[PDB]
Ligand binder design. Structure first.
Ligand SMILES: NC(=O)Cc1ccccc1C(=O)NC[C@H]1O[C@@H](n2c(C#CCOC[C@H]3O[C@@H](n4cnc5c(N)ncnc54)[C@H](O)[C@@H]3O)nc3c(N)ncnc32)[C@H](O)[C@@H]1O
Ligand SMILES: NC(=O)Cc1ccccc1C(=O)NC[C@H]1O[C@@H](n2c(C#CCOC[C@H]3O[C@@H](n4cnc5c(N)ncnc54)[C@H](O)[C@@H]3O)nc3c(N)ncnc32)[C@H](O)[C@@H]1O
Ligand SMILES: NC(=O)Cc1ccccc1C(=O)NC[C@H]1O[C@@H](n2c(C#CCOC[C@H]3O[C@@H](n4cnc5c(N)ncnc54)[C@H](O)[C@@H]3O)nc3c(N)ncnc32)[C@H](O)[C@@H]1O
Ligand SMILES: NC(=O)Cc1ccccc1C(=O)NC[C@H]1O[C@@H](n2c(C#CCOC[C@H]3O[C@@H](n4cnc5c(N)ncnc54)[C@H](O)[C@@H]3O)nc3c(N)ncnc32)[C@H](O)[C@@H]1O
Lengths: 263, 263, 263, 263
């Protein structure tokens, strides 16, 4: 099939990529980095996230695979020593796909800027452009809280082991179609009040962040962070789109969690 | 239809119950506390939990309703002033039902005691019988961690605003079919290691707690707490059974959260 | 004595200031905003912090007083209705002083920039200039941890009810001569490890933050935040200097905590 | 001098104890477990805590030393391989002493039971006798909060790395004369409100816990836990007494923290 391989660009990852290309040449496998059906990332989770975003417009037509040439990644979850076996099994195809949910972020502006949408595999976060971050949090059109603090983080299920975890969020199995909102350093006193707890939302729930005074915000989607100006609204919802993984063996999520954080 | 009304037993709740019975007498509504189709609880969330457990063997045939005669409850979410309207609308029926997921707890013993199962609407917790609480946590047959601490709490979605919240757990919308495990005071040092974060599990995942040395544990299910002896295993999974509520208007979960914790 | 009054600059605060000046004119009290012995701040805690920093070079010669024209402040802890009584009692003098500890922050640079020192009444924080914040944390010359995360916060005792509290830090009575370090969103996994817990340091302990790769950091001291370039070291220690308050009645710290966060 | 040695009672610890006694016999060192001047504990931190409580009535006349025959302890902080060097240096004396602060707990009863005082090296905790734990928290005679939850923990400085740490408390250098209060699972909602944050108190501050309805409590002091009945008040304050350690080299607290929790 059409495939491509992205590399972290260090010596180890580049050599593994060239060797896998040579192995794929021994099968009916065409290299095409325009319309691949298979996208292999070699490096770490950052490499894998860049691969996802390089091809985010063809997600339903691609099966992703990640190889970690450093320590075990949550997406880059296969070892370099298994690369030949990976080549053999992808070339023959007939493998099963596993799908993880994604986060849709919509940013609406004042007039002159059209709204923009972004897809996240880990999370989207919002922080101020300097000074206090203050937004009204509106859930399905219901005013829930006025948040004053450092920022907010909205995570996918597979993102829950990343920034979300450092913020106190729950780890959620990625078969759950949900998104999770965590606080960054909310103030709570006689004047200001937030829920504190992480909040877990199902599909079709919409969380809208609306500015109170300052309208400039630093918005991140996975590794990318951009200062957005004259923002009127930031809307989060579970995406209808899904990322598809090729799996060639059982490596359960909870075992990946164990392997990464416990032992 | 057949209905019954349970009361907290204070003056306010008993009088409201007698008045609602009188109002139901004005319709085709038979009082039956053996096979009710409608179970109305008057008091607080504790009253409602006792109603649920009184009828937990006929859950698929009952629609529950809670009236709070004190402050707003998460299950006792209707005001005494709306009791006449409640009577009018239940008697005519034709109302919609809302279903929340439940937690199944299985306790297995050494020989001589048969296993026991319990259903929880809020949560099930496990604590030691004195001294350190130590269990191996096994998720779908995979050894995940050895927990040493004060205890563990496994919450339903609607339970997440209760004990779970006080333990740092996420609040989850109750349409998500899941259960959530939180720690109570785990030790973490060079010898001992736990995940720390709350863990959110989907349907069909099984979490098994297995004793390491001491085999006696204090096990709670909602308000009930019993010392269990010669325990071999405690198994948690999302139940196939569901509790059904009568709803006569929109009172969204996230608005109940807001009303209870924010303002 | 020489005194001055700083105002938040809203209508309420400016009018109170002019009225207090008129009342001071009825005594032997000279207005001097160059060498005051008394510095009265009218507004909120931000106003009070700006007063402190305006006069931070004459701290041993000044008694500070804060009036809150909004809600109760932890430094602006007297009501506008008591302004006449305040005037009467300051003019006659003979009042007792209360002293709170301060935080000394030293920033050392590469060659071409001389080191700079800053005094904090609430806290000093450090965050990256974009991207991950990574520093080695060295305590009395002993390498304690490599921190990777969003940032770090070092609080005075009276600062512990401010940013420190939002970060999970302990509240400490301000008679304790100490400083407290809290984390902002540290990553912890197989590669990265931090203590997690807030750390409380006595006088003469020195905490040194040393860069690992990136050398640009956003450093804050109380309300002020500056991007510092080519930083070699950030050193924290309890200052030898103290801020002095005039007190005219008992308003215990723990009662201020209660009044601000409990009821 | 007079000395004694307490052992964990496993094979390793008993043999080390007999060998150290033999080595002490080669000097002017008399074994006396009634009035020792030196108390050596061999085992773990639990062994050391039992040694402390065995001799808590002669604390000003004793220098304690702990050897860990398992992993490094915070009190049992010397290795078995250094036992001969320990013998040599204790026998010659002339070593420096290091002192850590202690916690005084007073339990007052209804009539018929006289008040009781207890000294803690790690912490004192209070939990209910079954059901909710509810106390009024009074700080220097000022009503601070009504706590409803699982319990409360009051830690010494050297205790802050123990239970206190698992409860979210700050780690405090043990030269600070203070005690630290942490919550266990407080409920917070529209009816109930606590500070949440750990609270750090200096010497001479008194924290009084007063029952609201139930008067039976499980009170722990270090490893010991007793059910106390008809309790009227539990009072915490930093003790005037101090525990004294023999030190024969620099092993800084923050390095012990690093060695135990980081690497
Ligand atoms: N490039 C950087 O350095 C960013 C960073 C900033 C501050 C502090 C730490 C880092 C960090 O080291 N990053 C990578 C490590 O994250 C592991 N990783 C990644 C990923 C990725 C690529 O980077 C982008 C992601 O970084 C995260 N992130 C942002 N801020 C924080 C924070 N304060 N604490 C914790 N994580 C944070 C946020 O989720 C971004 O999407 N995905 C996952 C995952 N699903 N599950 C488990 N581990 C994951 C990956 O394997 C590494 O071990
Ligand atoms: N009878 C007691 O007093 C128990 C208790 C013990 C210690 C500290 C506090 C209490 C407590 O006051 N209980 C009731 C308050 O809980 C509200 N409530 C109840 C319920 C119920 C009936 O009681 C049993 C439940 O109590 C909980 N619980 C046990 N320990 C803790 C803890 N440490 N912190 C927080 N909650 C705890 C645990 O979930 C049990 O199922 N359900 C919910 C819900 N889904 N969402 C939001 N609020 C809820 C209810 O409306 C009241 O406001
Ligand atoms: N100007 C802003 O808005 C900053 C801010 C940014 C983000 C989120 C909230 C705010 C915030 O609203 N600020 C003021 C409120 O802080 C009360 N206050 C102040 C003070 C002051 C003046 O501002 C500067 C201080 O702000 C703090 N700060 C920075 N980030 C955070 C954060 N994420 N969460 C919580 N506090 C944060 C940090 O300590 C700075 O020194 N001192 C104290 C005090 N000793 N004890 C109790 N309350 C205090 C004051 O009375 C107000 O109620
Ligand atoms: N006997 C048990 O098993 C109790 C226990 C119960 C539940 C969960 C864990 C344990 C536990 O394993 N105990 C010992 C481990 O504690 C280290 N240790 C000890 C000590 C001691 C002797 O035991 C009594 C102490 O236990 C603590 N404790 C009570 N509950 C909890 C909890 N939930 N989480 C964390 N610690 C808890 C509480 O401070 C008691 O005074 N002192 C310290 C110290 N100053 N600094 C650092 N580590 C310490 C010691 O070296 C071991 O590594």
């Amino acid at each position: 099939m059409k495939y491509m391989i992205t590399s972290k660009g260090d010596e180890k990852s580049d050599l593994l990529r060239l060797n896998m290309i040579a192995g794929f040449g021994e099968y009916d496998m065409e290299y095409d980095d325009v319309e691949p059906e298979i996208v292999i990332s070699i490096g770490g989770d950052g490499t894998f996230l860049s691969a996802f975003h390089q091809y985010e417009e063809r997600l339903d037509e691609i099966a992703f695979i990640g190889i970690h040439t450093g320590h075990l990644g949550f997406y880059a979850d296969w070892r370099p020593a298994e690369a030949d076996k990976l080549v053999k099994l992808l070339a023959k195809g007939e493998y099963q796909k596993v799908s993880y949910p994604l986060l849709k972020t919509t940013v609406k502006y004042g007039i002159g800027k059209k709204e923009a949408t972004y897809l996240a595999l880990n999370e989207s976060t919002v922080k101020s452009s300097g000074g206090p971050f203050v937004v009204d949090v509106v859930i399905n059109d219901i005013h829930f809280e006025r948040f004053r603090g450092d920022g907010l983080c909205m995570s996918t299920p597979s993102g829950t082991t990343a920034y979300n975890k450092s913020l106190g969020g729950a780890l959620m199995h990625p078969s759950i179609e949900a998104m999770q909102l965590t606080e960054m350093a909310s103030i709570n006193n006689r004047v200001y009040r937030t829920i504190g707890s992480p909040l877990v939302f199902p599909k079709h729930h919409v969380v809208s962040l609306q500015p109170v005074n300052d309208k400039d915000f630093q918005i991140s989607v996975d590794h990318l962070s951009i200062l957005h100006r004259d923002v009127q609204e930031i809307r989060y919802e579970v995406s209808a789109k899904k990322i598809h993984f090729a799996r060639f063996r059982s490596f359960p999520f909870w075992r990946r969690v164990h392997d990464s954080f416990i032992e």
